[PDB]
Amino acid sequence: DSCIQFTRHASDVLLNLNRLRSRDILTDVVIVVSREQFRAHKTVLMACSGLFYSIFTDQLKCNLSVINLDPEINPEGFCILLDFMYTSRLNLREGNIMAVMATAMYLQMEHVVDTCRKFIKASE
Amino acid sequence: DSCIQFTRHASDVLLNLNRLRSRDILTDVVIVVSREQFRAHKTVLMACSGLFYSIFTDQLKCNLSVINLDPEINPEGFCILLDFMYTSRLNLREGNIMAVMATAMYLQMEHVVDTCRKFIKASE
């Protein structure tokens, strides 16, 4: 086509979606990870994770307001990944890399799994 | 912080939100523009437009499944802007620039209004 493009548009959209998350505006699901609860937007979770995409396209699960993750999932690893979904920034540290990689594999977040594998390979 | 950032994340998120729009997945509002209807995600509309941000943060309007725009609004101008919200690409043409600018002013989409004003000033 003959379209023009606004370079910062996608970043500005995600920044605003994160502002809605911070003020708990139009969040429509609770993700339960052991004793912790995380409120989020189903559409953002689907756009970032192959697992949430599969969950919320299911004719029964699409209507659930609460989703319980596998008990092996670490709440801190989930929190770091939820922050990444809404910001593009990943808080990857020596102390959390194993939990973050395991959580990204479960959530089906291929680019996160890839950088974790590379950071682990560098330290061996 | 000591975060790493995935450059393409925001663009990839918006691309997936547009795929959900195209398949009508988890759309939660109809925008009525004269005889035309446009299905969308409330969160994306709020993230792109000062008018939708004001509408869906209102305690009564946040619950509406149908929003009727002012009858002066052109459905084609709205369609072009809805496409821009989900893609960052604006189909700006000599034949539609006036309707697009009027619609972006009404929707409170400052960056679109700015490029329309510049393209109009160049042709005078």
């Binding site: 379209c3 023009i4 493009q5 606004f6 370079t7 | 690409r89 604006l90 960056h111 490029t115």
Partner: peptide, 4 residues
């Protein structure tokens, strides 16, 4: 704004 750019030409994509």
């Amino acid at each position: 704004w750019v030409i994509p």
